[PDB]
Amino acid sequence: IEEGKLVIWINGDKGYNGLAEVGKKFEKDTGIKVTVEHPDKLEEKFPQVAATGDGPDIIFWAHDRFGGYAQSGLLAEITPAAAFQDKLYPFTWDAVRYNGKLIAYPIAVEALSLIYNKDLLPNPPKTWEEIPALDKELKAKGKSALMFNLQEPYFTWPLIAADGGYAFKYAAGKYDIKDVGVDNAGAKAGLTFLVDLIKNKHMNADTDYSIAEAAFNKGETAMTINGPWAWSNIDTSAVNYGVTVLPTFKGQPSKPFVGVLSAGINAASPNKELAKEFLENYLLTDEGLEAVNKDKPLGAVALKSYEEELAKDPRIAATMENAQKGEIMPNIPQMSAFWYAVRTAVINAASGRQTVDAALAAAQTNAAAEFMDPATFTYQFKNVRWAKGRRETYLCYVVKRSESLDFGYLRNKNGCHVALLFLRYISDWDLDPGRCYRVTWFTSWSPCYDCARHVADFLRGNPNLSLRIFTARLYFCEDRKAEPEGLRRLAEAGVQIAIMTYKDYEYCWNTFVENHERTFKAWEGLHENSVRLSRQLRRILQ
DNA sequence: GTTCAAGGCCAG
DNA sequence: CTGGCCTTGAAC
Numbered sequence A: 001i002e003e004g005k006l007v008i009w010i011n012g013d014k015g016y017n018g019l020a021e022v023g024k025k026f027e028k029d030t031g032i033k034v035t036v037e038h039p040d041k042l043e044e045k046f047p048q049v050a051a052t053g054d055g056p057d058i059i060f061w062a063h064d065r066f067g068g069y070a071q072s073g074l075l076a077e078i079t080p081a082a083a084f085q086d087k088l089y090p091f092t093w094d095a096v097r098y099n100g101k102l103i104a105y106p107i108a109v110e111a112l113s114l115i116y117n118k119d120l121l122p123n124p125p126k127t128w129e130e131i132p133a134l135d136k137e138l139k140a141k142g143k144s145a146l147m148f149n150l151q152e153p154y155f156t157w158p159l160i161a162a163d164g165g166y167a168f169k170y171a172a173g174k175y176d177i178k179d180v181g182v183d184n185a186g187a188k189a190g191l192t193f194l195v196d197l198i199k200n201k202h203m204n205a206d207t208d209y210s211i212a213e214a215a216f217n218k219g220e221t222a223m224t225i226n227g228p229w230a231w232s233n234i235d236t237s238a239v240n241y242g243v244t245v246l247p248t249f250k251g252q253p254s255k256p257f258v259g260v261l262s263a264g265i266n267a268a269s270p271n272k273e274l275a276k277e278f279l280e281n282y283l284l285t286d287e288g289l290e291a292v293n294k295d296k297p298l299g300a301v302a303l304k305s306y307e308e309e310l311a312k313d314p315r316i317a318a319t320m321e322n323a324q325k326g327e328i329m330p331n332i333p334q335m336s337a338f339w340y341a342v343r344t345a346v347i348n349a350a351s352g353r354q355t356v357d358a359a360l361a362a363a364q365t366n367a368a369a370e371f372m373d374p375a376t377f378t379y380q381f382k383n384v385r386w387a388k389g390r391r392e393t394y395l396c397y398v399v400k401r402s403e404s405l406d407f408g409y410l411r412n413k414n415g416c417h418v419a420l421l422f423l424r425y426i427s428d429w430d431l432d433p434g435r436c437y438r439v440t441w442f443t444s445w446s447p448c449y450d451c452a453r454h455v456a457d458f459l460r461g462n463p464n465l466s467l468r469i470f471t472a473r474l475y476f477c478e479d480r481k482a483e484p485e486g487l488r489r490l491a492e493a494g495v496q497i498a499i500m501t502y503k504d505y506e507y508c509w510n511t512f513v514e515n516h517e518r519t520f521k522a523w524e525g526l527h528e529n530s531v532r533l534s535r536q537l538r539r540i541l542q
Numbered sequence B: 001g002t003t004c005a006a007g008g009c010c011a012g
Numbered sequence C: 001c002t003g004g005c006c007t008t009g010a011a012c
């Protein structure tokens, strides 16, 4: 990666010609040549090229991915003067904050907003409470009052979070994975209001994104909840429409998930200061953001002055208002487990195949943290000799597909070994047998014969699951004849059986245990017993 | 008095 | 080496 040269990466849907002209101005004034590129899957390409000390100097992308980029140390820390931080809206600086330090510059803002038909509705409602009544008046003209993408949780969430609902609480630049406001009085209030809308068939509950877009754009529905990304379509449908504040539930504004288009600096770049100069003095200006805007819209912008210039468009003003009344979409990994655990919980509560409090309790306990005790982990997972005197078996699990879904741990309970309890857990949890899942195990004791048979059968029945088992110790009762054949039976079923090495103990120590920012402490004889036990295992399977 | 973590010795 | 078995210091 060169010095004195700036390489900028921006997605294809965002206007790169105006940004390129900004770079031409920067080269005109300074002499540093700027080259902008719009590759494909740059959100995928950037981590790999950046891990090698290569890639772009600056990367433009939504702020949520920048958290994953920040955990991998691929983003330099920025310390812009408070005089510059005052130039942008304050809540936009929270979307570029990761682990307590700024990793990117806020550029653009996106959020859900209410899109209504001006002809059918000259005065849109300001409250969800007015929606049923209105619908009954419009169901007589052959019209629906409101239809949106009830399947995905990004669209139904604003009404849920309007009253005391949230994903994870946020002390400064910090989220708390342990606390999830999915189960709450107000969250149940919003969800039950949604269910009261779908019971009366004000919304058929089968509505997806395209059904609601075809419905609204062909004049059928009077209102739909959507973002700027679809505006262009409604502009060619010849429909006269408007964008406005999302209605308020219980008098409280609904909270959509705000996405912040951001410009981050590659940590491997030698041109960090050149990048900060370009971004602070050329991009983040009225002239820079306007030059970018004329090519392709940015929606609302974080720069106060230019956002005031753009608010003359009532649509963009609505976008910024709903953004300020909403909440920043978190950038941490657990958010994935959130989406999934909510994506089902509303659907089950939508069709009526599960009651509200059950769906929301299961959703909260699903996407939430629970961590093991450090003394408990160290006691239960010690691979030594003289470890046969341990009764309880602990199992730390990870469910992924690459989307790392729920993780946690299970222990022994009333005769039910941990493997069977995980079979009941993953069975109560529904499955979509069109996509494979990759399940990882960390066990105190390896599976016994009954557990090997039950698990191997479960694997025969659900051939989309693929399991790997890391065990601390090898268990035998009636040594040398029962368990080795059971472990070979799991081997026949295609279960990757390894014995935990040191790196596995690090992974478990930093993944499943509540360590209190304490480094992992290996005991005496860990490696010796590990190669030991791995030798016995290689002797067993092969 | 009793239970347990830990370690070493010896015989296969 | 691997597995089986006693001793011990110290904690419940």
Ligand SMILES: Nc1ccn([C@H]2C[C@H](O)[C@@H](COP(=O)(O)O)O2)c(=O)n1
Residues within 6 Å of the ligand: A391, A392, A393, A394, A412, A417, A418, A445, A446, A447, A448, A451, A475, A477
């Ligand atoms: N795959 C295995 C094998 C054994 N065990 C533990 C749990 C049981 O409590 C005990 C079974 O043996 P017993 O009940 O005879 O002690 O060993 C376990 O948790 N998981």
Ligand SMILES: [Ca+2]
Residues within 6 Å of the ligand: A365, A366, A367, A368, A369, A370, A406, A407, A408
């Ligand atoms: Ca969990």
Ligand SMILES: [Zn+2]
Residues within 6 Å of the ligand: A417, A419, A447, A448, A449, A450, A451, A452
């Ligand atoms: Zn078992």
